Design an enzyme around this catalytic site. Structure first.
Site, PDB file in Angstrom:
ATOM      1  N   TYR A  26       1.936  19.898  45.067  1.00  0.00           N
ATOM      2  CA  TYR A  26       2.974  19.704  44.060  1.00  0.00           C
ATOM      3  C   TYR A  26       3.809  18.478  44.368  1.00  0.00           C
ATOM      4  O   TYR A  26       4.032  17.647  43.497  1.00  0.00           O
ATOM      5  CB  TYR A  26       3.861  20.935  43.990  1.00  0.00           C
ATOM      6  CG  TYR A  26       4.824  20.954  42.840  1.00  0.00           C
ATOM      7  CD1 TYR A  26       4.374  21.063  41.529  1.00  0.00           C
ATOM      8  CD2 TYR A  26       6.211  20.915  43.070  1.00  0.00           C
ATOM      9  CE1 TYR A  26       5.282  21.113  40.476  1.00  0.00           C
ATOM     10  CE2 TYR A  26       7.110  20.962  42.042  1.00  0.00           C
ATOM     11  CZ  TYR A  26       6.652  21.066  40.751  1.00  0.00           C
ATOM     12  OH  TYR A  26       7.569  21.097  39.723  1.00  0.00           O
TER      13      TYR A  26
ATOM     14  N   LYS B 138       4.346  15.237  42.002  1.00  0.00           N
ATOM     15  CA  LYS B 138       5.677  14.878  41.540  1.00  0.00           C
ATOM     16  C   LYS B 138       6.151  13.511  42.064  1.00  0.00           C
ATOM     17  O   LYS B 138       6.778  12.722  41.333  1.00  0.00           O
ATOM     18  CB  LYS B 138       6.675  16.002  41.862  1.00  0.00           C
ATOM     19  CG  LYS B 138       6.483  17.285  41.034  1.00  0.00           C
ATOM     20  CD  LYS B 138       6.086  16.981  39.579  1.00  0.00           C
ATOM     21  CE  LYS B 138       6.376  18.161  38.637  1.00  0.00           C
ATOM     22  NZ  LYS B 138       6.214  17.719  37.218  1.00  0.00           N
TER      23      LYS B 138
END
Lengths: 241, 232, 238, 236
Positions: free
Chosen positions: B151, B155
């Site tokens: 993640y 991001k």
């Protein structure tokens, strides 16, 4: 309606300057009661009479600790609570570091940093007491990136950001926010010179005062209740953090 | 009058729950014509807001479906002015145990579908000399965070992708900017000076700001809306 | 002495390229046993033969997930445990975004970001069991600044910093640090526009990056993790 | 041997405190001639007596503008040119913002920022003339992250980075780098701890190594940066 500021009380320092004027105007347009600070009273009452109602005027010299303290108490008292402190006023003393005099370093620190410290101190206890407030500090792209010729200015503007962070943490529980806006290069008292800078602005144009003014409105809004401690960069993509 | 988007056409991905829905509502409240992306029938949200709405189901894991998604929204709205890259997933867990699937999947949605959808809308926005791209990244893209190697990559790469595209298309008046939501358990509250969770409306407001005409001179940036959890 | 690396085992990817060979040489000279990765194995042997003692050769195609897994395993076993991983190999597929290909995005992503994942996944558990390790990732200035005509590269190099930050937090307690180095521009209208933005007014050499690797790889940098070291002539100042 | 400093002349401020000492040790073990600044003279002569020769001793009160300038002049002359300046000494006047006095701000800025200005202004031109120099400023994670109770300190430490970036841009072409190290680092000492991934305090030598790195010929392409040595407390 969204980003409304009706009934909100604002004090804007350096409010006859390019950015300060523009910010003052925008706050007013969104329905704020606006206090305008400046060094010259004449220039101030002039912006006043032009805006009409919901304006106060507070001349004071920011070099002068005692006048800064008084500036705070005055604003807070005549305005009946300052909800929004915008620290915009700030001077330069540009020159190479190795030629830079004590007086040129001192003046910049004492104006761009310590007068910010003392004005903010006059108004933060009241804001906390009320459980509401916005402290918005105009820094510069230059406080993040650095710039030759401005060792003093960059220090004063980087420091402004770290003052902002420490305060923000300290008073967040009391619903008071503190944030910085970092303008790039904006049209003001200011061709090769110019070309060198423009070559690093992807948007290939200078900024205007409305660009900073609207970032102030955004940060002062209720809708920005959950933003504190941040630096909002407004610069045509000159530096990308 | 300030921050008015009346008549501007916006596409929000992942509009069905949480941030997407709150983002879509605020865009609607400000006059925008809002194209609603989601995976599932969405028809409900459409019915709540009524006028000035489109519905665009698609599976973001399907590069083909993301292309059509963008071609369809461009076509049927008469040109998308605002793209909000909102949708995104997690496959949380310790790095040591992390599947190729958990890595692949997170990157496929959070990064590559954003590559693809944006690629669909950028030239059209360039040719019109007007455009906003707003990407929802995360506090965790900047700070890092355990259990979320995949993640955080997605991001963090989302930010990086946005800066580069910001520089290319700036001179054609298309901006591109990220918003980093914070958290949105008392371990988490401990590190939030403001001592509250964020809500959708806090992120939706930042969307409107960035999407507004008044933010024409903002591009390449990341707006942290996080109760002061990490201060940049 | 300080920053001494003798007894240590390193794997360097893209060891034949400009930064890789510099990185390899400096680790070697500091006493380390270095495993040189590359694709063209014959270029590896050339470097080996020059360097002599304390060298392994590990050819591998990093675009090939299977081969990346095998590369980790082989370095772990043959070297007697890897202590330092330098993720250095990384590609470019430059060009304006609006012209960019599905394959131009995916290939940069899979080399620059996911092969790092797999390779690093192969060696962290071993380093965690030994309770000592160094993951060092070669990012790039542009991963922080952005740069036009490089949306794919920039995504990959920013994500790799995000990758490292998350991982750094996971394994800090078991004494494995993970850090990134961000080189600026390193060895005629394009050229001197770049040079116009470097206050030092010179290009960077592999030894400037190589030194930052030695610094981070050393025991002396045990309290450094999740960070990004910029070595860039002052082009961008973080 | 990589990162050798033999014959290079360094000046270290706050050389009796934890960090300053370790820094002084690491520079002196890597061959450098080190001048030791400190508020307290007894501890200086003690530390100077401990390390071999290649040690000079200059006490000074950094709250005193004129003593700051005199420190610089004396180190430049008595060592015949300083090569490396480590601005390490700093002070705190902690307290809640709302109760912070004019002096608690003033004293923090004069030392951590404006005495750094002066010292650095005394030595940079000489360094530039010699086509060689290292300016190394000890800032603090708190300068980056902010920290409650430390509005004055946070301002000074943040200011310190900004100043460093600016001076670095001015003088890069002259082969003098200017960089910052940011260290991290009752028993709610345990609250700080949980927030550190490495679950450990910073020691002097962690910072001392970062200084030797940045002081080396090998770090010549590094200028205008902040090196975080904090066990992952904050990740930039």
């Amino acid at each position: 309606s969204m980003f409304d500021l009706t009934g909100r009380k604002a004090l804007v320092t350096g409010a006859t300057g390019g950015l300060g004027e523009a910010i003052a105007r925008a706050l007013h347009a969104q329905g704020a009661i606006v206090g305008l600070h400046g060094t010259r009273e004449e220039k101030l009452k002039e912006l006043a009479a032009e805006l009409g109602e919901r304006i106060f005027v507070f001349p004071a010299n920011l070099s002068d600790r005692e006048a800064v303290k008084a500036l705070g108490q005055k604003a807070e008292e005549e305005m009946g609570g300052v909800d929004i402190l915008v620290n915009n006023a700030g001077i330069t003393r540009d020159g190479l570091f190795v030629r830079m005099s004590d007086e040129d370093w001192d003046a910049v620190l004492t104006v761009n940093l310590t007068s910010v410290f003392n004005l903010t101190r006059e108004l933060t206890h009241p804001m906390m007491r009320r459980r509401n407030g916005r402290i918005i500090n105009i820094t510069s792209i230059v406080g993040v990136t650095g710039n030759p010729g401005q060792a003093n200015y960059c220090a004063s503007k980087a420091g402004l950001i770290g003052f902002s962070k420490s305060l923000a943490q300290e008073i967040a529980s009391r619903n008071v926010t503190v944030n910085c806006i970092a303008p790039g290069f904006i049209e003001s008292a200011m061709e090769k010179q110019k070309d060198a800078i423009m070559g690093n602005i992807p948007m290939k144009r200078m900024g205007v005062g409305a660009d900073i003014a609207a970032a102030v409105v955004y940060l002062a809004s209720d809708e920005a209740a959950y933003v504190t401690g941040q630096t909002l960069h407004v610069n045509g993509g000159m530096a990308m953090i």
